[PDB]
């Protein structure tokens, strides 16, 4: 029973690694790179996907399936496994993607022939390849999403694929591993924890009051997958003291993620189960309103708060974000709030830089607004969360991260007691 690391390895995107033991090989994840990996997907695996026995999903997001259609259109036919969360999500994900893509590397005959091929596997549904035992654990990062448990060959592996934050209450907990002989895992922000959720939520109560009451704006820049829907379940719960204004979630794409969220009720908390069973969907907040088309989109910028903004993208790379920021960010009465962390270089950190002005949309934008910025909405485990993870785990290869991020992650998993390693593309390891 070997791993071997084909993307992710010091780097956040491309997760997809390949498992062999049994005499088979069973591929775990297949996303695709972003950003300035992005070229990346037009060049090879590394492997040979007509050798492969099955695929295992852990959850639906673009840098987790995002490699699959490449994956049939250069041969696999072998079946695809995934919760019916991740599967009803991947079909959104993936058709979104064939339509937004520069150089699309494949086509929609591939995405319709890797959709042909899903099956659902539940939590604690146990998978047999060969004299392999497959079984998904909780991993709270998304509706539907896991780690993978992999035993054979009289060992254990987890693939903990990305583990949510526990502190929010969309999400139910993730499920700590069992003992495992081999633990491969990500460490997105192993160098930090998060600021605890609770107080985050006050104070995006008080910007929002605040803002609100004076007729000023909220722009808020969000994921379309599921960062946007927190924000519609924290503005639905704390709506009856939030000043009256309507909510536009200006994302034909979360728009889309939302109204699949009813027939995934069983895929949430606790706490969310419980208002869906009062006969309430607590992902809609009063006033809150989908903006389809450009035209409706552009009329905001335009037109007077109070109202609250989700767009994206998420990280102001694009999206109709861009053009709400273009005519918001010059009144003092308006709010930016950044519901996770803005990446180094890009212009979200300018704009927390603080400067006078910012350039958006080939032009220089005043910068009078309010900023605020709520790491604590961050979908991933800290790095106390992660350390309590992967607690008693004897050997662990980090993969899912920045190469100083895992580090500082490994160097505290080191004085632990505990051997670690940083995967390698490529280089496969010892379960
Ligand atoms: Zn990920």
């Not at 007509?50 to 295992?56: F, G, M, N, R, T």
């Not at 041969?75 to 058709?95: N, Q």
């Not at 604590?376 to 004897?394: I, K, N, R, T, V």
Request: hydrophobic share 40%; net charge negative; glycine share 12%.
């Amino acid at each position: 029973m070997r791993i071997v690391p084909f993307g992710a390895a010091r780097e956040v995107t491309g997760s997809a690694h390949l498992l062999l033991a049994g005499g088979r090989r069973v591929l775990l994840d297949c996303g695709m790179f972003q950003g300035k990996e992005e070229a990346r997907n037009h060049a090879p695996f590394g492997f040979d996907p007509k050798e492969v026995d099955a695929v295992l999903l852990t959850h639906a997001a673009l840098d987790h399936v995002g490699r699959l259609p490449k994956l049939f259109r250069e041969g696999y036919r072998g079946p695809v496994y995934a919760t019916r969360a991740t599967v009803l999500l991947m079909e959104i994900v993936l058709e979104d993607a064939l339509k937004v893509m520069d150089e699309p590397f494949f086509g929609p005959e591939d995405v319709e022939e890797a959709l042909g091929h899903l099956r659902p596997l539940e939590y604690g549904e146990w998978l047999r390849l060969g004299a392999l035992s497959l079984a998904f654990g909780q991993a709270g990062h998304l509706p539907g999403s896991a780690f993978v448990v992999a035993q054979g060959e009289g060992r254990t592996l987890v693939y903990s694929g990305d583990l949510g934050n526990r502190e929010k209450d969309v999400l139910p907990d993730p499920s700590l591993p069992p003992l495992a002989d081999l633990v491969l895992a990500e460490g997105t922000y192993g160098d930090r924890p998060h600021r605890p959720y609770r107080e985050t939520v006050r104070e995006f109560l008080e910007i929002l009051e605040k803002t609100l009451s004076q007729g000023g704006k909220v722009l808020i820049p969000t994921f379309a997958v599921e960062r946007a829907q927190e924000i519609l379940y924290v503005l639905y719960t704390h709506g009856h003291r939030l000043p009256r204004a309507p909510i536009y979630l200006d994302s034909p794409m979360a728009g889309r993620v939302l109204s699949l969220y009813p027939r995934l009720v069983r895929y949430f908390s606790e706490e969310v189960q419980a208002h869906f069973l009062q006969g309430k969907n607590p992902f809609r907040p009063a006033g809150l309103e989908v903006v389809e088309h450009t035209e409706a989109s552009k009329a905001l910028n335009r037109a007077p708060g109070p109202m609250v903004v989700l767009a994206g993208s998420g990280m102001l790379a694009g999206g109709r974000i861009l053009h709400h920021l273009k005519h918001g960010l010059s009144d003092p009465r308006n709010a930016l709030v950044f519901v996770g962390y803005q990446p180094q270089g890009g212009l979200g950190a300018e704009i927390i830089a603080r400067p006078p002005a910012v350039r958006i949309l080939g032009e220089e934008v005043p910068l009078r607004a309010s900023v605020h910025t709520l790491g604590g909405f961050s979908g991933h485990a800290g790095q106390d969360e992660l350390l309590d993870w992967l607690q008693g785990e004897p050997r662990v290869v980090l993969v899912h991260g920045e190469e100083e991020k895992l580090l500082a992650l490994g160097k505290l998993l080191a004085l632990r007691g505990q051997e670690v390693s940083l995967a390698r593309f490529g280089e496969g390891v010892p379960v």
